[PDB]
């Protein structure tokens, strides 16, 4: 009764934090570009003004500059091992698989009270949470191992 509250509260907190991480664009503070190439406009001919940015998983944005707030969509595939890593970082399957496993975890906890004799539902919850953390580990490594190329 009192140990399930921490489990329920923790599961919500973890799912909430992982949905706001995946959804927001404050994963990295780099110094790149956030606007498409101004071919005709010739604002800077080709290479625009590199300014401080805040990147995420899908969109890059600009803190300072005359384009403050413009958010381009990160282009992963530019121009085997490298290609596979770029297909896993682009889709963000592991940061999104964690979300799905954190969600399934809480579903089991919800089901753990409408069926108080099926003890194998609480075990499934725990496995989903442990597995969700494992996916988070992979996602973090994949994300960091991609930004270094």
Partner 1 sequence: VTTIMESPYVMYKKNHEMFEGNDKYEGYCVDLASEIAKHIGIKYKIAIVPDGKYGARDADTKIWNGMVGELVYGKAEIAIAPLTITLVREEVIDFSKPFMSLGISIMIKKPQKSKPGVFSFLDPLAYEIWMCIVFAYIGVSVVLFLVSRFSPYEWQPPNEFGIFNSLWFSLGAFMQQGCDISPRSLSGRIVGGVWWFFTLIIISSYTANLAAFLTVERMVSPIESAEDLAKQTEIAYGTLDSGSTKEFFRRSKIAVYEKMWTYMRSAEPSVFTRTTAEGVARVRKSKGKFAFLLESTMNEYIEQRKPCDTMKVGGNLDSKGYGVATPKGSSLRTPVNLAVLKLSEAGVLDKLKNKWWYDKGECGSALSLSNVAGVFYILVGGLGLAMLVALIEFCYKSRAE
Ligand X SMILES: *C(=O)CCCCCCCCCCCCCCC
SS3 of residue 8 by DSSP: helix
- Of residues 19 and 124, the one with the C-beta less far from ligand X: 124
Tokens found for residue 39 = 């071919």
Q: Round to whole Å and give the CA distance between 112 and 12.
A: 15
CB of 55 to partner 1, least distance (A): 17
Segment (H or E) for 107: helix 93-114
CB of 145 to ligand X, least distance (A): 17
User: Between 38 and 77, how does the x/- string for binding to partner 1 read (CB under 8 A)?
Assistant: ------xxxx------------------------------
Contact of 94 with 135, CB cutoff 8 Å:
yes
User: Between 106 and 135, how does the x/- string for binding to ligand X read (CB under 6 A)?
Assistant: --------------x--xx--xx--x--xx
């Amino acid at each position: 009764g009192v140990q399930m509250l921490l489990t329920i509260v923790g599961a919500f907190a973890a799912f909430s934090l992982m949905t706001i991480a995946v959804g927001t664009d404050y994963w990295l503070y780099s110094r790149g570009v956030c606007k498409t190439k101004s071919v005709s406009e010739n604002e800077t001919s080709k290479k625009n003004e590199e300014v401080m940015t805040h990147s995420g998983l899908w969109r890059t944005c600009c803190l300072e500059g005359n384009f403050k707030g413009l958010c381009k969509q990160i282009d992963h595939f530019p121009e085997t091992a490298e290609y596979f890593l770029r297909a896993v970082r682009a889709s963000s399957i592991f940061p999104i698989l964690s979300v799905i496993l954190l969600f399934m975890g809480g579903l089991c906890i919800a089901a753990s009270e409408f069926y108080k004799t099926r003890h194998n539902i609480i075990l499934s919850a725990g496995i989903f949470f442990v597995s969700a953390g494992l996916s988070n580990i992979i996602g973090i490594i994949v994300y960091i191992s991609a930004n270094a190329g």
